[PDB]
Design a protein around this nucleic acid. Structure first.
Ligand SMILES: [Mg+2]
Ligand SMILES: [Mg+2]
Ligand SMILES: [Mg+2]
Ligand SMILES: [Mg+2]
Ligand SMILES: [Mg+2]
Ligand SMILES: [Mg+2]
Ligand SMILES: [Mg+2]
Ligand SMILES: [Mg+2]
Ligand SMILES: [Mg+2]
Ligand SMILES: [Mg+2]
Ligand SMILES: [Mg+2]
Ligand SMILES: [Mg+2]
Ligand SMILES: [Mg+2]
Ligand SMILES: [Mg+2]
Ligand SMILES: [Mg+2]
Ligand SMILES: [Mg+2]
Ligand SMILES: [Mg+2]
Ligand SMILES: [Mg+2]
Ligand SMILES: [Mg+2]
Ligand SMILES: [Mg+2]
Ligand SMILES: [Mg+2]
Ligand SMILES: [Mg+2]
Ligand SMILES: [Mg+2]
Ligand SMILES: [Mg+2]
Ligand SMILES: [Mg+2]
Ligand SMILES: [Mg+2]
Ligand SMILES: [Mg+2]
Ligand SMILES: [Mg+2]
Ligand SMILES: [Mg+2]
Ligand SMILES: [Mg+2]
Ligand SMILES: [Mg+2]
Ligand SMILES: [Mg+2]
Ligand SMILES: [Mg+2]
Ligand SMILES: [Mg+2]
Ligand SMILES: [Mg+2]
Ligand SMILES: [Mg+2]
Ligand SMILES: [Mg+2]
Ligand SMILES: [Mg+2]
Ligand SMILES: [Mg+2]
Ligand SMILES: [Mg+2]
Ligand SMILES: [Mg+2]
Ligand SMILES: [Mg+2]
Ligand SMILES: [Mg+2]
Ligand SMILES: [Mg+2]
Ligand SMILES: [Mg+2]
Ligand SMILES: [Mg+2]
Ligand SMILES: [Mg+2]
Ligand SMILES: [Mg+2]
Ligand SMILES: [Mg+2]
Ligand SMILES: [Mg+2]
Ligand SMILES: [Mg+2]
Ligand SMILES: [Mg+2]
Ligand SMILES: [Mg+2]
Ligand SMILES: [Mg+2]
Ligand SMILES: [Mg+2]
Ligand SMILES: [Mg+2]
Ligand SMILES: [Mg+2]
Ligand SMILES: [Mg+2]
Ligand SMILES: [Mg+2]
Ligand SMILES: [Mg+2]
Ligand SMILES: [Mg+2]
Ligand SMILES: [Mg+2]
Ligand SMILES: [Mg+2]
Ligand SMILES: [Mg+2]
Ligand SMILES: [Mg+2]
Ligand SMILES: [Mg+2]
Ligand SMILES: [Mg+2]
Ligand SMILES: [Mg+2]
Ligand SMILES: [Mg+2]
Ligand SMILES: [Mg+2]
Ligand SMILES: [Mg+2]
Ligand SMILES: [Mg+2]
Ligand SMILES: [Mg+2]
Ligand SMILES: [Mg+2]
Ligand SMILES: [Mg+2]
Ligand SMILES: [Mg+2]
Ligand SMILES: [Mg+2]
Ligand SMILES: [Mg+2]
Ligand SMILES: [Mg+2]
Ligand SMILES: [Mg+2]
Ligand SMILES: [Mg+2]
Ligand SMILES: [Mg+2]
Ligand SMILES: [Mg+2]
Ligand SMILES: [Mg+2]
Ligand SMILES: [Mg+2]
Ligand SMILES: [Mg+2]
Ligand SMILES: [Mg+2]
Ligand SMILES: [Mg+2]
Ligand SMILES: [Mg+2]
Ligand SMILES: [Mg+2]
Ligand SMILES: [Mg+2]
Ligand SMILES: [Mg+2]
Ligand SMILES: [Mg+2]
Ligand SMILES: [Mg+2]
Ligand SMILES: [Mg+2]
Ligand SMILES: [Mg+2]
Ligand SMILES: [Mg+2]
Ligand SMILES: [Mg+2]
Ligand SMILES: [Mg+2]
Ligand SMILES: [Mg+2]
Ligand SMILES: [Mg+2]
Ligand SMILES: [Mg+2]
Ligand SMILES: [Mg+2]
Ligand SMILES: [Mg+2]
Ligand SMILES: [Mg+2]
Ligand SMILES: [Mg+2]
Ligand SMILES: [Mg+2]
Ligand SMILES: [Mg+2]
Ligand SMILES: [Mg+2]
Ligand SMILES: [Mg+2]
Ligand SMILES: [Mg+2]
Ligand SMILES: [Mg+2]
Ligand SMILES: [Mg+2]
Ligand SMILES: [Mg+2]
Ligand SMILES: [Mg+2]
Ligand SMILES: [Mg+2]
Ligand SMILES: [Mg+2]
Ligand SMILES: [Mg+2]
Ligand SMILES: [Mg+2]
Ligand SMILES: [Mg+2]
Ligand SMILES: [Mg+2]
Ligand SMILES: [Mg+2]
Ligand SMILES: [Mg+2]
Ligand SMILES: [Mg+2]
Ligand SMILES: [Mg+2]
Ligand SMILES: [Mg+2]
Ligand SMILES: [Mg+2]
Ligand SMILES: [Mg+2]
Ligand SMILES: [Mg+2]
Ligand SMILES: [Mg+2]
Ligand SMILES: [Mg+2]
Ligand SMILES: [Mg+2]
Lengths: 386, 52, 131
RNA sequence: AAUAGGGUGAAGCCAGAGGAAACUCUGGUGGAGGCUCGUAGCGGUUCUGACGUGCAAAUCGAUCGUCGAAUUUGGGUAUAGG
RNA sequence: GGCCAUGGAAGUCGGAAUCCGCUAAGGAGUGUGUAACAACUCACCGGCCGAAUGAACUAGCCCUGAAAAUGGAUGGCGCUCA
RNA sequence: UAACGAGAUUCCCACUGUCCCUAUCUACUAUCUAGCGAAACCACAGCCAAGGGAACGGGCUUGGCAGAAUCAGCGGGGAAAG
RNA sequence: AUAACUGGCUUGUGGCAGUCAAGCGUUCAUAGCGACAUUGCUUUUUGAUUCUUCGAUGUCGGCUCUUCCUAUCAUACCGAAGCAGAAUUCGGUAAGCGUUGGAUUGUUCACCCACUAAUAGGGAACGUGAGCUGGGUUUAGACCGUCGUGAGACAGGUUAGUUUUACCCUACUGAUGAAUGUUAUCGCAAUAGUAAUUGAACUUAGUACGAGAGGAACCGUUCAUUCAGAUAAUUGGUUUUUGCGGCUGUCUGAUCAGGCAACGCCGCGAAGCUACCAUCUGCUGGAUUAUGGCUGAACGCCUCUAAGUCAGAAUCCAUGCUAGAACG
């Protein structure tokens, strides 16, 4: 017999299996499609989730009841110090898919990126890339030959870049190394750009502009093993049910004499790889700017950091990106920021954002001050100040 | 945008922070956090709350 | 005649609110909410500015035992406005109206949510303080 | 042989008041009852709770009926398979 | 402008009639188009051309008729002058 | 039919997480370890679909397929056990 | 060797659909219907039978959850009308997507109130009891009515009546892992899965249409329903932070400072977790179905079709998204 009433299914079948990600660094499954006519430019950047804040902004949305009126919106801070270019990979179009042809590396690698290739760095002789560094001996013709091979045969050129994680407050010393696809220009142009950028820093302001829409690749928060009630949002069984109520009562019909793959079952929740799209860039801040949190209406000399620092992260002393809303991951997670895969002309995508004010009260409690000067002005002299 | 002031303690209210209570007599009350709001719903005297 | 943003629902089916107009009713018992879709076991629920089908549980005898439209004008469940402000009233109140949103009373006691006044010009006309 | 602590306030009795009388009223005192709230006790309503290869071949937890009598109970004794 | 109905319908609204004359040729009308006519077009007759043509029926294969629940069975693959 | 009722039934006030619609916390389990160490059950065993068949196959036929050793949960099946 | 669930054959009966076309439809058989007859399909009815199970397959209903069918209630695109508009009716491709909240009833069924785009019908051992519940039915106690001399009966009514076990195998959900020289980093992508859905308001516009009454639609704009995936700014919830303060009883001769009350109680309470009780995000190309066409024979005309060809659906395949074959 049929179900008494027709209700929608619990959960999405397009995010199965709900298993842990193979790596903690989210990987870009698909890059923006290459257009030769554009200039040579990067399509992605690596950052670290610092924390969330609040802004005030005047809305430009004709026909809305909040048009030209202040709205209060949640925002996410991504600490993004400039990345260092250390390598380049060539991809070839084959009848079996993309296949990596060659990887060319830079002469000098910093210690933070050479720690990426080790599980026990302190016990090692640190021999990685020493003979390869010797490959540059007084003519470096091996490197030029491989680069010419890439120019001759590669159809997709990607750069290898790593974060400068020593500039962040994280205690982790391993850098995060990723492939970032190069778009724009011919294959020769991409290869020349990659070679000429070896051992150089690339900033966020060269990849993302303000008011842009970008996508976020990250691994979500882990919750461990979870029951069906919270893992899948199933209905709780009555209070008086024997042997418990946080279950799915019927896990299958008599036939097929098996449990179906579509039935909600208890298991591991969170720590999934996710791609979240259409997050607007409200601010690309600079670490050298002493008015990160200042706007054109709030001229308080103020960094983006709240009072007492970001909870469980620290201070953002680098360039940063202020994104609208929420992005996947937890604090300190490595986050991949990717350019959008399509052209959005909606009023939400083309609106020019001008910020009024950014909240910098403490996130560690009911903070009520934006600045220590404001605090001591409100409370006056204390006993500890003498 | 405007900085608001707590009705019970004088604490500075920034956009979004705290709750806003409209009594039956349409008097508008502003609370910067749940702490002062909870005291007010207990009909405490802010004049006698030692930190307001 | 209006497009108000989503608000936290305050009055599920079975809730009894105050009747804030001088029509002679004192209670308004919610039995349905206009615009409620389908979801198994989920109760229809109304926010301020929502049209409701209601009966008068307490009031003049000629107002009792009938289904009539009403509009919620204030709610005690806090809800967030697009300016970030969380606000709530001291009580939940409504007024009896037509299917067109026209009041059967002629005055409103107490404040009215700006969400409700922005959506029903009839209730705005008869309203005093609007928050 | 055993049965915390409270509530209610029956007869009888004392004083005063009204009435022509027959009588009535008020304030106390008194401490009745297979009365009542409720321990121990005796019982075992509900969770159709726990457990349900148990601590246990009937228990455990909360909740509950009654709790000064047709009360509870030890021992001795009598009644024995149509 | 055949008639009667019908304001009128004159072929083209419903009824009648179902005629005659000439015509190789014309329905007292095929339709468009009209308030009706006009107007255009078909039955209809001819002028042109260079051998087929029209109607009804019969039965072979194929198609329609042909809608059920796990995914699935000419045994499977697959097969189209097989 | 007053009073009484762990009796059956309907409604109202208060209360409420019974529910909208779920969330959070504590102890003991579960979990891992040292030591100790049973029982039910057992033709052989253990992936599916269709066919046919004692008309609902783990085994047969035809297909899909198929790669050691494993852990915590789970309650579709073993037409599970009793 | 034989009756009460499911299952199997049948399909009278139940349900659904055809054929001819006497009639209905102001005229007019077939826009929409359609008698007398006649051909079928289905197994959600009930019969008929008794093949399997009586060294037992837990027999109603509801709750929960997944999936499938289409004879489509709504949503997409269209053809038809006795389609002027609006509305409505018939039909095609269509199961991608949705199909509700309640009063009474154990109910399935039913019937009302109400919202809604719609409140379609069904299957999977009449799905689903080592998932629950146990109101009904169907043990034993008891009451009533009728029947019986009686013990008792009732397919009549009523009340109270134990719902057991998973640690095995498989399967599902997740989690490790030997060996394919070792170890590390970055990758490719076969295959499998897949995601969005519907409504309202403004403008178009009191316009087209219409005597009037009435009254659309495309582009665009702002919101909302159901769903999905995240997130913890803010607000709310939670407190063994037993963090701070308060309170009672008792104990330490008093104070200070503490112990206990099977976390003693109360107010606040960060962090963490978490809520349509909070916020953010949910993409764009091709090929097609129905259908409407172009050229064009067959058949000197005609014809969307035969060869060839254009546009085109909530469909399909990609883009994108999830896993990464532990013998790629
Ligand atoms: Mg069912
Ligand atoms: Mg790709
Ligand atoms: Mg090589
Ligand atoms: Mg090579
Ligand atoms: Mg945890
Ligand atoms: Mg944790
Ligand atoms: Mg949980
Ligand atoms: Mg139970
Ligand atoms: Mg157990
Ligand atoms: Mg915080
Ligand atoms: Mg709070
Ligand atoms: Mg329900
Ligand atoms: Mg006297
Ligand atoms: Mg006296
Ligand atoms: Mg006494
Ligand atoms: Mg007492
Ligand atoms: Mg006894
Ligand atoms: Mg007991
Ligand atoms: Mg029990
Ligand atoms: Mg047990
Ligand atoms: Mg027992
Ligand atoms: Mg008691
Ligand atoms: Mg007691
Ligand atoms: Mg007793
Ligand atoms: Mg008693
Ligand atoms: Mg005997
Ligand atoms: Mg004998
Ligand atoms: Mg004998
Ligand atoms: Mg005998
Ligand atoms: Mg067939
Ligand atoms: Mg089939
Ligand atoms: Mg075949
Ligand atoms: Mg065949
Ligand atoms: Mg053969
Ligand atoms: Mg009772
Ligand atoms: Mg009772
Ligand atoms: Mg009765
Ligand atoms: Mg266990
Ligand atoms: Mg051990
Ligand atoms: Mg043994
Ligand atoms: Mg079949
Ligand atoms: Mg077969
Ligand atoms: Mg079979
Ligand atoms: Mg068979
Ligand atoms: Mg069968
Ligand atoms: Mg099988
Ligand atoms: Mg078997
Ligand atoms: Mg085989
Ligand atoms: Mg194994
Ligand atoms: Mg089983
Ligand atoms: Mg077993
Ligand atoms: Mg059965
Ligand atoms: Mg069957
Ligand atoms: Mg039949
Ligand atoms: Mg049949
Ligand atoms: Mg029949
Ligand atoms: Mg018929
Ligand atoms: Mg026909
Ligand atoms: Mg049958
Ligand atoms: Mg039927
Ligand atoms: Mg038999
Ligand atoms: Mg049988
Ligand atoms: Mg049997
Ligand atoms: Mg049995
Ligand atoms: Mg059995
Ligand atoms: Mg048997
Ligand atoms: Mg049986
Ligand atoms: Mg069974
Ligand atoms: Mg029910
Ligand atoms: Mg169909
Ligand atoms: Mg249709
Ligand atoms: Mg007609
Ligand atoms: Mg479906
Ligand atoms: Mg299908
Ligand atoms: Mg789609
Ligand atoms: Mg509804
Ligand atoms: Mg219903
Ligand atoms: Mg109900
Ligand atoms: Mg009810
Ligand atoms: Mg009900
Ligand atoms: Mg009921
Ligand atoms: Mg119905
Ligand atoms: Mg059946
Ligand atoms: Mg059944
Ligand atoms: Mg059971
Ligand atoms: Mg059942
Ligand atoms: Mg079962
Ligand atoms: Mg019963
Ligand atoms: Mg049963
Ligand atoms: Mg009985
Ligand atoms: Mg009889
Ligand atoms: Mg008699
Ligand atoms: Mg008798
Ligand atoms: Mg009998
Ligand atoms: Mg009976
Ligand atoms: Mg009964
Ligand atoms: Mg179990
Ligand atoms: Mg168990
Ligand atoms: Mg076992
Ligand atoms: Mg076994
Ligand atoms: Mg497996
Ligand atoms: Mg497994
Ligand atoms: Mg897995
Ligand atoms: Mg859409
Ligand atoms: Mg208008
Ligand atoms: Mg008008
Ligand atoms: Mg007009
Ligand atoms: Mg006009
Ligand atoms: Mg006009
Ligand atoms: Mg007209
Ligand atoms: Mg009008
Ligand atoms: Mg439109
Ligand atoms: Mg969620
Ligand atoms: Mg506390
Ligand atoms: Mg206190
Ligand atoms: Mg004290
Ligand atoms: Mg002590
Ligand atoms: Mg203590
Ligand atoms: Mg004690
Ligand atoms: Mg609190
Ligand atoms: Mg909090
Ligand atoms: Mg913490
Ligand atoms: Mg959601
Ligand atoms: Mg949205
Ligand atoms: Mg997407
Ligand atoms: Mg196209
Ligand atoms: Mg075509
Ligand atoms: Mg063709
Ligand atoms: Mg991989
Ligand atoms: Mg692999
Ligand atoms: Mg091999
Ligand atoms: Mg091999």
């Amino acid at each position: 017999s049929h179900r008494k009433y027709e209700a929608p299914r619990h959960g999405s079948l397009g995010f199965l299996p709900r298993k842990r990600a193979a790596k903690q660094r989210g990987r870009v499954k698909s890059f923006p499609k290459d257009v030769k006519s554009k200039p040579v430019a990067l399509t992605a950047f690596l950052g670290y989730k610092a924390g969330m804040t609040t802004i005030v902004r005047d809305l430009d949305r004709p026909g809305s009841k909040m048009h030209k009126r202040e709205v209060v919106e949640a925002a996410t801070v991504v600490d993004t110090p400039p990345m260092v270019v250390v390598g380049v990979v060539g991809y070839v179009e084959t009848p079996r898919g993309l296949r990596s042809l060659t990887t060319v590396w830079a002469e000098h690698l910093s210690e933070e990126v050479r720690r990426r290739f080790y599980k026990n760095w302190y016990k090692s002789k640190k021999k990685a890339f020493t003979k390869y560094s010797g490959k540059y001996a007084t003519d470096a013709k091996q490197v030029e030959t491989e680069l010419a091979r890439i120019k001759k045969y590669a159809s997709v050129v990607r750069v290898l870049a790593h974060t400068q994680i020593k500039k962040t407050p994280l205690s982790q010393k391993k850098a995060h190394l990723a492939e970032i696809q190069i778009n724009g220009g011919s294959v020769s142009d991409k290869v020349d750009w990659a070679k000429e950028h070896f051992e150089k820093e690339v900033s966020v302001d060269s990849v993302f502009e303000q008011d842009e829409m970008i996508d976020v690749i990250a691994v979500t928060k882990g919750h461990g093993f979870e029951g069906v009630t919270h893992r899948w949002g199933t209905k709780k069984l009555p209070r008086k049910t024997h042997r418990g109520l946080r279950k799915v009562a019927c896990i299958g019909a008599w036939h097929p004499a098996n449990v179906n793959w579509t039935v909600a079952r208890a298991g591991q929740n969170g720590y999934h790889h996710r791609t979240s799209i259409n997050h607007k860039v409200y601010r690309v801040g600079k670490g050298t700017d002493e008015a990160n949190g200042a706007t054109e209406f709030d001229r308080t000399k103020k960094t983006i950091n709240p009072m007492g620092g970001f909870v469980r992260y620290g201070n953002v002393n680098n360039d940063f990106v202020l994104l609208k809303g929420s992005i996947p991951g937890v604090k300190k997670r490595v986050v991949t920021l990717r350019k959008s895969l399509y052209v959005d002309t909606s009023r939400r995508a083309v609106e020019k954002v001008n910020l009024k004010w950014i909240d910098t009260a403490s996130r560690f409690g009911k903070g009520r001050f934006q600045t220590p000067a404001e605090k001591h002005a409100f409370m006056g002299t204390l006993k500890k100040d003498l | 945008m405007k900085i608001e002031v707590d009705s019970f303690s004088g604490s500075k209210i920034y956009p979004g922070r705290g709750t806003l209570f409209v009594r039956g007599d349409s008097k508008i009350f502003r609370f910067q956090s749940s702490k002062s709001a909870s005291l007010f719903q207990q009909r405490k005297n802010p004049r006698r709350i030692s930190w307001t | 005649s209006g497009n108000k943003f989503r608000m936290s629902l305050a009055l599920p089916v079975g809730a009894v609110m105050n009747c804030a107009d001088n029509s002679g009713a004192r209670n308004l018992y919610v039995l349905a909410v206009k615009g409620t879709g389908a979801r198994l076991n989920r109760l229809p629920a109304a926010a301020a500015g929502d049209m409701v089908m209601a009966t008068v549980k307490k009031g003049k005898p000629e107002l009792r035992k009938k289904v009539m439209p009403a509009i919620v004008i204030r709610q005690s469940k806090p809800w967030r406005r697009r300016d970030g402000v969380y606000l709530y009233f001291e009580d939940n109140a409504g007024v009896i109206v037509n299917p067109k949103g026209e009041m059967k009373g002629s005055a409103i006691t107490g404040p009215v949510a700006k969400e409700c006044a922005d959506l029903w010009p009839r209730i705005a006309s008869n309203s005093g303080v609007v928050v």
